[PDB]
Design a protein around this ligand. Structure first.
Ligand SMILES: CCCCCCCCCCCCCCCCCC(=O)OC[C@H](COP(=O)(O)OCCN)OC(=O)CCCCCCCCCCCCCCCCC
Ligand SMILES: CCCCCCCCCCCCCCCCCC(=O)OC[C@H](COP(=O)(O)OCCN)OC(=O)CCCCCCCCCCCCCCCCC
Ligand SMILES: C[C@H](CCC(=O)O)[C@H]1CC[C@H]2[C@@H]3CC[C@@H]4C[C@H](O)CC[C@]4(C)[C@H]3C[C@H](O)[C@]12C
Ligand SMILES: C[C@H](CCC(=O)O)[C@H]1CC[C@H]2[C@@H]3CC[C@@H]4C[C@H](O)CC[C@]4(C)[C@H]3C[C@H](O)[C@]12C
Ligand SMILES: C[C@H](CCC(=O)O)[C@H]1CC[C@H]2[C@@H]3CC[C@@H]4C[C@H](O)CC[C@]4(C)[C@H]3C[C@H](O)[C@]12C
Ligand SMILES: C[C@H](CCC(=O)O)[C@H]1CC[C@H]2[C@@H]3CC[C@@H]4C[C@H](O)CC[C@]4(C)[C@H]3C[C@H](O)[C@]12C
Ligand SMILES: C[C@H](CCC(=O)O)[C@H]1CC[C@H]2[C@@H]3CC[C@@H]4C[C@H](O)CC[C@]4(C)[C@H]3C[C@H](O)[C@]12C
Ligand SMILES: C[C@H](CCC(=O)O)[C@H]1CC[C@H]2[C@@H]3CC[C@@H]4C[C@H](O)CC[C@]4(C)[C@H]3C[C@H](O)[C@]12C
Ligand SMILES: C[C@H](CCC(=O)O)[C@H]1CC[C@H]2[C@@H]3CC[C@@H]4C[C@H](O)CC[C@]4(C)[C@H]3C[C@H](O)[C@]12C
Ligand SMILES: C[C@H](CCC(=O)O)[C@H]1CC[C@H]2[C@@H]3CC[C@@H]4C[C@H](O)CC[C@]4(C)[C@H]3C[C@H](O)[C@]12C
Ligand SMILES: C[C@H](CCC(=O)O)[C@H]1CC[C@H]2[C@@H]3CC[C@@H]4C[C@H](O)CC[C@]4(C)[C@H]3C[C@H](O)[C@]12C
Ligand SMILES: C[C@H](CCC(=O)O)[C@H]1CC[C@H]2[C@@H]3CC[C@@H]4C[C@H](O)CC[C@]4(C)[C@H]3C[C@H](O)[C@]12C
Ligand SMILES: NS(=O)(=O)c1cc2c(cc1Cl)NCNS2(=O)=O
Ligand SMILES: [Zn+2]
Ligand SMILES: [Zn+2]
Ligand SMILES: [Zn+2]
Ligand SMILES: [Zn+2]
Lengths: 334, 332
C-alpha cells in the first residue's frame, strides 16, 4: 500500500504528522493535577474502585490461551496483559507506586497494583507505546529483566533501544511507523508499530527525541490493538483499514481534562468511542484512568462519559467495557 | 546520676563509647555486592515466607488492651507492638527501596507484609536513627496523611525539622536519657536510651542528628527496641535504670565484614549479649532477612543466633525469630 502516514521527523526530532497538533506544553508539577477529583478514603476508593486478585495468583495454571479465544487482564493504568495465539505479552508495565524520576515528587497511584512481577506468569514480550513515566517504569523494567532476561522480547519505538540496553535488556527491538517484527519462536504472530498523536519526554531537552505510537498484534487466530496515549488523529482510520477487523482494542479514556490543552495529546471518552469505531474492533477496553491522576477530571467521571458517548454512537457496554483493577475477560472468536 | 550521658564533639554528636572507628565511606563503591545472592523465587517463598498479618482478615482483634503484649514483624526494623492500651510502630519502611534515589540503593527482596492502609490505628511511632533503612520519607508521608496529630512521632534530637518539613505536628525530639508520654494514655512512658550507631542521609549531614534506642515502660509490660547498634555499654545501664523488660527487639543482621561492621553493628552473638545486658525475658530479632546491607548470607543471621543461643546457656524460646508478617502474644 502507500496511503499510510509515515513519520514525521522535523529538523532532528519527531513531530506528529497529523494536522490537529499544536506545539505548546508546560509540563507536570502539580498545576492541573492538584485534587480536582479528591479520591477520598482508600475504603471509598475500594468501594468505588475495588482491586481484584488476578486469576493467575490463585490458579497459576490456565494461564495459556489454548488458541481459540483471547484473554485479557487489566493491571491498572495502561498495563495490560494479553494472552493470545500461544503468547502472553504485557503492555506499558507500571508496578511502582509513583510514576516519577524522583521519590519525593510525582504522581503516586491511588490504587495499588493488582499483582507483583514475581506473581505474573511467563511473559514472552512487552510493548512500549511511548516513554512517559506512567508507561515506562525503570523499576518495572529492572524487575522484568531480572526475573526474565533474554527470555523477554521488548518492542519499543525508535530512540528507546539505547535506553533499553542501558537498563540491561538484550532482546530489544526498535520499530518505526508501519514497521513489523515477531517473537523468535512464534513467527506466525506479527507485532507492528502504528502511528499515534502523542509526545515523548523524560528529561530536559530530550523532548520527542524518542517516538510515541501504538501497537497492532496480528496473529493468525486473533487480532489485537493497543492505542497507548493519544489525542484523536486520522491515523486510527488508516490502522483500521490496513490491519482489518480487531478482536480487542485497548483505548485510553482518562486524562482528558483542560481539553483546550490536552485535546492534542489525550482523547476524551467521546473521541475514545470514535477510535473504537475507526479501528474496526469488535470490542474495546478502557485503559488509562482510575489509577493515576494525570489531569483535572473527576476520577470516576471517565467511565460515565464513556457510557454517555457509547449511547451517542448507538452502542452498548458490551461493545466497549471498563474492567475492575485486576479483573480479566475472555473473548472467543468466530 | 550514672548512665552514659549524651555527648557532643566540637562539631557533631559522638558515641562517647570506648569501642570506636571512622571511615564511614557509604556503600556504593566500597562493598556493593551480594555474595549472599538471594535468588530462585521458589527458594525465597520457602526459606523466607511472607505472612498475611492478622489485622488484615480480622482487624477487629487489635489485641492487647489487656495486660499481655503482642508484636508483629513487618520486615527489617518496622515492627508493630501492641501493648498497655497503645499500638506503636517502629522504624517504619514500606517502600521497596531504602535509598534517596529511585534507581540505585538497596531494594528489598521481601515485600512488606501489609500496607499502610491495612494498618490498624497506630498511636505512636519510634525512629531509631535517620538511615534510609529506618527512615522512609514515603512511609512517613503516608502515616502523616492517614493519621495526623493523632500520631505521636518520637524522634531523636535533630529530626524535629525533617519531621515538620514532612508535615508532622505531633513530634517529640528527645536526647537519650530523656522521656515523654501519650496525651490520653500517659501512664505509659517512652524513653530515649543510648546506642552505638551513626546518622547520615546526605553529604555533610554526618552525625547532625542523634541515634539511640527506645524503652517503653508501661504500667503492665516493658518493651525495649535497640534499633541499630554495635556492642557497647549502656545496655547494662538500660537494664539497670529500667528493667526487667518483657520483650526486646535486637538487630541480628548486617554484621560482616566484621572488621568494619563490628563497631557499628552487633553480630548475633553480640545480640545475645544484649539479651543478657538489657535484662529482657524474651527477644524478637530485627534487621536481617529484608534488605542486603552487608556481605553475610541472607539466611546466616538466624543460624549464628542459635549458635550464640546455646553457647551462652540459652534456648530458642528465649530469643526467637519470627517470620515476615508473623505475630506473637506474650502473657508474662
Ligand atoms: C530541576 C527540578 C525538576 C523536578 C522534577 C521532579 C519530578 C517531576 C515530576 C513529574 C514527573 C512526571 C509525571 C508523570 C509523567 O511522565 O506523566 C506526565 C506526562 C505524560 O503523561 P500523559 O499520560 O501523557 O498525560 C499527562 C498530561 N500531562 O509526562 C511528562 O510530563 C514527562 C515528564 C516531565 C518531567 C520531566 C523530568 C523533570 C526532571 C528531569 C531531569 C532533572 C534532573 C536534572
Ligand atoms: C554524586 C553524588 C552522590 C551520589 C550518591 C547517590 C546514591 C547513594 C545511595 C545511598 C543508599 C543508602 C543505603 C541504605 C542506608 O541508609 O544504609 C546504609 C547506611 C546505614 O546502613 P546500616 O544498616 O546502618 O549499615 C549498613 C552498613 N553500610 O546508610 C548510609 O550510608 C547513609 C546513606 C548516605 C548516602 C548519601 C547520599 C546523599 C545524596 C547525594 C546526592 C547529592 C547531589 C545533589
Ligand atoms: C519553579 C522552579 C524554580 C523556582 C524559581 O527559582 O523560580 C523551577 C526550576 C526548575 C524547574 C523544573 C525543571 C525541570 C522541568 C522542566 C520543564 O520545562 C517544566 C517542568 C520542570 C519539572 C520544571 C518545573 C519548574 O519550572 C521548576 C521546578
Ligand atoms: C537527597 C535528598 C533527600 C534527603 C532526605 O531524604 O533527607 C533529595 C530530596 C529531593 C531531591 C531533589 C529533587 C529535585 C531534583 C530531581 C532530580 O530527579 C534529581 C535532582 C534533584 C535536585 C533531587 C536531588 C536529591 O535527590 C534530593 C535533594
Ligand atoms: C532539599 C533542598 C533543600 C534542603 C536544605 O537545604 O535543607 C531543596 C532546596 C532547593 C529546592 C528546590 C527549589 C526549586 C523547586 C521548588 C519547588 O517548590 C519544589 C521543587 C524544587 C525543584 C526544589 C526541590 C528541593 O526542595 C530543593 C532542592
Ligand atoms: C549507575 C546505575 C548503576 C550503578 C551501580 O550501582 O553499579 C545505573 C544502572 C542502570 C542505569 C540507568 C539505565 C536507564 C537510563 C539510561 C539513560 O541513558 C540515563 C538514565 C538511566 C535511568 C540510567 C541511570 C543510571 O546510569 C543507572 C541506574
Ligand atoms: C554533569 C554530568 C556529567 C557531565 C558530562 O558527562 O559531561 C552529566 C552527565 C549526564 C547528565 C545527566 C544525563 C541524564 C539527564 C539528561 C538530561 O538531558 C538532563 C538531566 C540528566 C539527569 C543529566 C544531568 C547531568 O548534567 C549529567 C549527570
Ligand atoms: C568513583 C566515582 C567517580 C569515578 C572516578 O574516580 O572518576 C565517585 C564519584 C562520587 C563518589 C560518591 C560520593 C559520595 C560517597 C563518598 C564515600 O566516600 C563513598 C561512597 C560515595 C557514595 C561515593 C561513591 C564513589 O566513590 C563515587 C560515585
Ligand atoms: C545517568 C548519567 C548519564 C548517562 C548518560 O547520559 O549517558 C550518569 C553519568 C554520570 C553517572 C554517575 C557517575 C558517578 C557514579 C558512578 C557509579 O558507577 C554509579 C553512581 C554515579 C553517581 C553515576 C550515576 C549515573 O549513572 C550518572 C549520573
Ligand atoms: C533523572 C535520571 C533518570 C532519568 C530516567 O528515568 O530516564 C536520574 C537517573 C540517575 C540519577 C542520579 C543518581 C545519582 C544521584 C542521586 C541523588 O539522589 C541525586 C543526584 C544524582 C546524580 C541523580 C540525579 C538524577 O535523579 C538521575 C540522573
Ligand atoms: C520539594 C518537596 C515538596 C514540593 C511540593 O510541595 O510540591 C518537599 C516536600 C517534603 C520535603 C522533604 C521533607 C524532609 C526533608 C527536609 C530536609 O530539610 C530536606 C530533605 C527532605 C527529604 C525534604 C525534601 C523536599 O523539599 C521535600 C520532598
Ligand atoms: C544548589 C542549592 C543552593 C541553594 C541554597 O543556598 O539553599 C544547594 C543548597 C542546599 C543543597 C542541598 C542540601 C542538603 C544536601 C547536601 C548534600 O551535600 C547534597 C545533597 C543536598 C540535598 C543538597 C543539594 C544542593 O546542593 C542544594 C539544594
Ligand atoms: N520495586 S517496584 O517498583 O516493583 C515496587 C515499588 C513500590 C512498592 C512495591 C513494589 Cl513491588 N511499594 C511501595 N511503593 S514503591 O516504593 O513505589
Ligand atoms: Zn503519556
Ligand atoms: Zn499517559
Ligand atoms: Zn543504620
Ligand atoms: Zn540499619
Amino acid at each position: 500500500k502507500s496511503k499510510k502516514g509515515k513519520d514525521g521527523r522535523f529538523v532532528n526530532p519527531w513531530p506528529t504528522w497529523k494536522n490537529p497538533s499544536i506545539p505548546n506544553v508546560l509540563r507536570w508539577l502539580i498545576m492541573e493535577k492538584d485534587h480536582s477529583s479528591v479520591p477520598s478514603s482508600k475504603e471509598e476508593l475500594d468501594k468505588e474502585l475495588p482491586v481484584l486478585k488476578p486469576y493467575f495468583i490463585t490458579n497459576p495454571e490456565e494461564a495459556g490461551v489454548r488458541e481459540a479465544g483471547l484473554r485479557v487482564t487489566w493491571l491498572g493504568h495502561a498495563t495490560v496483559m494479553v494472552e493470545m495465539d500461544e503468547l502472553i505479552f504485557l503492555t506499558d508495565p507500571i508496578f511502582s507506586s509513583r510514576a516519577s524520576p524522583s521519590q519525593y515528587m510525582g504522581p503516586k497511584r491511588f490504587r495499588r497494583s493488582p499483582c507483583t512481577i514475581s506473581e505474573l506468569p511467563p511473559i514472552d514480550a512487552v510493548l512500549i507505546s511511548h516513554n512517559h513515566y506512567d508507561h515506562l517504569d525503570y523499576n518495572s523494567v529492572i524487575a522484568l529483566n531480572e526475573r526474565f532476561g533474554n527470555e523477554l522480547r521488548w518492542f519499543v519505538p525508535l530512540g528507546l533501544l539505547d535506553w533499553m540496553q542501558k537498563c540491561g535488556c538484550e532482546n530489544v527491538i526498535e520499530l518505526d511507523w508501519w514497521e513489523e517484527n515477531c517473537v523468535p519462536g512464534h513467527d506466525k504472530v506479527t507485532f507492528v508499530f502504528t502511528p499515534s498523536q502523542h509526545w515523548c519526554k523524560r528529561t530536559l531537552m530530550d523532548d520527542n527525541k524518542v517516538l510515541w505510537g501504538s501497537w497492532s498484534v496480528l496473529g493468525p487466530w486473533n487480532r489485537f490493538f493497543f492505542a497507548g496515549d493519544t489525542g484523536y488523529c486520522p491515523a486510527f482510520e488508516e490502522i483500521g483499514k490496513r490491519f482489518g477487523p480487531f478482536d480487542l482494542a485497548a483505548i485510553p479514556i482518562g486524562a482528558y481534562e483542560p481539553r483546550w490543552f490536552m485535546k492534542y495529546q489525550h482523547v476524551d471518552p467521546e473521541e475514545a468511542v470514535r477510535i473504537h469505531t475507526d479501528v474496526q474492533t469488535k470490542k474495546s477496553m478502557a485503559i488509562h484512568w482510575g489509577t493515576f491522576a494525570l489531569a483535572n477530571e473527576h476520577y470516576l467521571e471517565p467511565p460515565v462519559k464513556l457510557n454517555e458517548a457509547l449511547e451517542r454512537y448507538g452502542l452498548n457496554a458490551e461493545d466497549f467495557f471498563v474492567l475492575k483493577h485486576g479483573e480479566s475477560r475472555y473473548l472467543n472468536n468466530d
